[PDB]
Design a protein around this ligand. Structure first.
Ligand SMILES: Nc1ncnc2c1ncn2[C@@H]1O[C@H](COP(=O)(O)N[C@@H](CCC(=O)O)C(=O)O)[C@@H](O)[C@H]1O
Length: 124
């Protein structure tokens, strides 16, 4: 099946643009990345940095993960991100999201060889 590293790129990487322009970004992105298939995925973040810059986080600030593992890393720099969060009114199969652009540090869990993000833990 899809590796954890590949799923991360699918769910969280969008190096295309440097930021969210349109208010339908999330609606569009959540559909295309297969995140509205069976249910509406309620919350998701996309990172608008290069894959190299994101993978480099795995050699930055080591921190605990939410689940208590210690293979999580905080980015030294703030990154361009978009937070997608389902509206109060959203109902499958017409999944509806609010798009919010931010610049924040990301925290990711890293694993494997090469040692790359496999989970998006938080932005801060
Ligand atoms: N440290 C951990 N290492 C590996 N898996 C973990 C860890 N911790 C939990 N999992 C479980 O494996 C999934 C893979 O991480 P996602 O990037 O897909 N999921 C984000 C939602 C996306 C967002 O927030 O933008 C999240 O739930 O934070 C987690 O949802 C959790 O069920």
């Amino acid at each position: 099946k899809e590796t954890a590293a590949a799923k991360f790129e699918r769910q969280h990487m969008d190096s295309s643009t440097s930021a969210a322009s349109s208010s339908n970004y999330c609606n569009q992105m959540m559909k295309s990345r297969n995140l509205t298939k069976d249910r509406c995925k309620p919350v998701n973040t996309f990172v608008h940095e290069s894959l190299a810059d994101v993978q480099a986080v795995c050699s930055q600030k080591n921190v605990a993960c939410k689940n208590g593992q210690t293979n999580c890393y905080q980015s030294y720099s703030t990154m361009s991100i978009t937070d997608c969060r389902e509206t109060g009114s959203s109902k499958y199969p017409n999944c509806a999201y609010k798009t919010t652009q931010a610049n924040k540090h990301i925290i990711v869990a890293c694993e494997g060889n090469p040692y790359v993000p496999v989970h998006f833990d938080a932005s801060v």
